[PDB]
Amino acid sequence: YNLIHLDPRTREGFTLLHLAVNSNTPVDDFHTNDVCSFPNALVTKLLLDCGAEVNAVDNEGNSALHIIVQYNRPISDFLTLHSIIISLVEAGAHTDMTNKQNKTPLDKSTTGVSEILLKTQMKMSLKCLAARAVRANDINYQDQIPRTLEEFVGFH
């Protein structure tokens, strides 16, 4: 919890949660490959229990949910994909969060398993549909909505 509140940031903007769910996080050639294999369900769950910023955004734009859904092994270790997906979603994750390239996590999936597994967790909301409609047609929302909605519109 102390380290999470320190809020570390890798040169690519990867927070502590982004690395725990990314399969691109390197593990050194020693015996750590036998145990410390990423993404890990237990590591992500422990980070979320310690108040990790689930909606943290790197400089690329990907949230903690865009990074996982690009996982290239969705079947052999489907347990540690499903566990991280549900752990993210039930804590604070915004399933419809739009990165800097206008990509929904469903768009940046490249996998049917992750796409439909996330769709099973996507609680549709009128707030998200209205945010998408506001962003798509570029309505000037400055100071005409609550401030928390302004960053919410920025999310979509």
Next chain:
Amino acid sequence: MYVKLISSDGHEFIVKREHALTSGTIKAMLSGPGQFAENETNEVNFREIPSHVLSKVCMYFTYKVRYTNSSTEIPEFPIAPEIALELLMAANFLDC
């Protein structure tokens, strides 16, 4: 089983009660000293939501109840450009 959502203009949008409780505040507005367990009116007075956007909220309620578990290429919700940014804060107030 029919909650009556009044609007800022008096447009009483009577909707199915199970449909309306998909929103948090309408679930909360009927919870507590607003229950009125007599199935007579069960009315809700939105003194800050215009009728034209409360109607879209009610269409959203019906749309969500219908297409919750389907996910079989659900049709896109028609939000007019002018009524957005009113629907946005309406759904902020009436959460989901």
Next chain:
Amino acid sequence: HIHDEGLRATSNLTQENMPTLFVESVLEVHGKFVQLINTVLNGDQHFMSALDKALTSVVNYREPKSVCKAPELLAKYCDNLLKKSAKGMTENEVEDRLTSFITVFKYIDDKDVFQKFYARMLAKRLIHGLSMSMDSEEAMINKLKQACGYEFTSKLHRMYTDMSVSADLNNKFNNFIKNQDTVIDLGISFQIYVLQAGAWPLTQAPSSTFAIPQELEKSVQMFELFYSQHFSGRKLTWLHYLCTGEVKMNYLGKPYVAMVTTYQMAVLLAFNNSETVSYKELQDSTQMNEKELTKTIKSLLDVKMINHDSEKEDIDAESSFSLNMNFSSKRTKFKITT
């Protein structure tokens, strides 16, 4: 224990420099017991809350059938730190001794009384020039804003802002005097400390009533025109008793200057036309109440610039005085304090 420790550290003080002793004693107790809690009791939250509660019961320790001395003592401690004096402290020293002071201040639990007392002392230190550093006043005002809410230091910060923006007002007034139709004669050097009513604790209460002297009515008129043209919709009421002016006594030897209040200044006007002036002969021009006139006359008789022609030195209906031509002062800058 901490409670009793406070009663063995702050209740034993006997007058003297109590403002610098009460706060220092409470700070010493706090520093001893927060060091002990942090290094022995692991800095536990419950024990820190116990420390804060005990010191809350210690700082504003109310003697039965009496008001707590904590707010006035803390206000006087801040006054003594901020007021310029020969104590030799520097800006760093008074900045440190006020940052540590806030630890005592948070336990007052009677913040309104401290606000009233601090406003009363800040008014004096800003009007009479007793402030050591204006930046120090700003720092102390800002520290109380960080301790408790802005509504606490609303009037205080407004008083500080009023006293800060006075040179600019005087410069604008001089510019208006220069660029106002003909060259208005500046027979006086008129610097004004304009203040916001409601902010400052000063109350005019003009039941005493006063009449401005003739040589000052022109300045009143030109400043009224300046403050009605440059600024709009502002009732400028005149706070007479705090106005002071200097006079050099060229009537006798020209030895010194005689800085004196306006109420006592209006005494000298009638004495300027004729040396012998009676009580009502003085009063017809000032047109003030009997109490303030008697007080000013008594203060001037202590100054003894005017000598009582009547043998009865006590103030009565006649009460005719004159200029004491034999009176002289040791210094060349004979300021009359109140």
Next chain:
Amino acid sequence: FEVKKWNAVALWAWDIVVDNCAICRNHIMDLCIECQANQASATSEECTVAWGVCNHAFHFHCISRWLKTRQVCPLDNREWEFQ
């Protein structure tokens, strides 16, 4: 024995009892909240007082920022026009 230097002190009120920028909830004669921050860049004079026809007082920055989207006076919901 004549007056040559004078110090004078005079109070002043606003001729209308107003005691807070209702937008900012700090006093109008104080700096606005927007100018409360970046006080080094602010000159402490730009925080002028703006008066409407409704005899309500706010800082110029505050009522200007409020007027960029809402054309109505913040306190009483009627149209706003400067003095």
Next chain:
Amino acid sequence: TSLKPRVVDFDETWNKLLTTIKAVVMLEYVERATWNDRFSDIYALCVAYPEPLGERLYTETKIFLENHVRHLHKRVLESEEQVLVMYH
């Protein structure tokens, strides 16, 4: 009136809100119109212009709670042998 951020005076809305939250924590009777009108007051405070008063609303509610349960604690402790039925 709409749902846009508007200028809200906390010291008056809270007083209009305290009379409801004080009567809903004691299970007194508050009319349905007032209860439905309060949901706008928390909303108005939480999106107030130009600084949301969610911190002020939460702090004042916490202060009221600690000044209400402590009032209940004195009453329960006031009764000597009935502290169980006064607690319940």
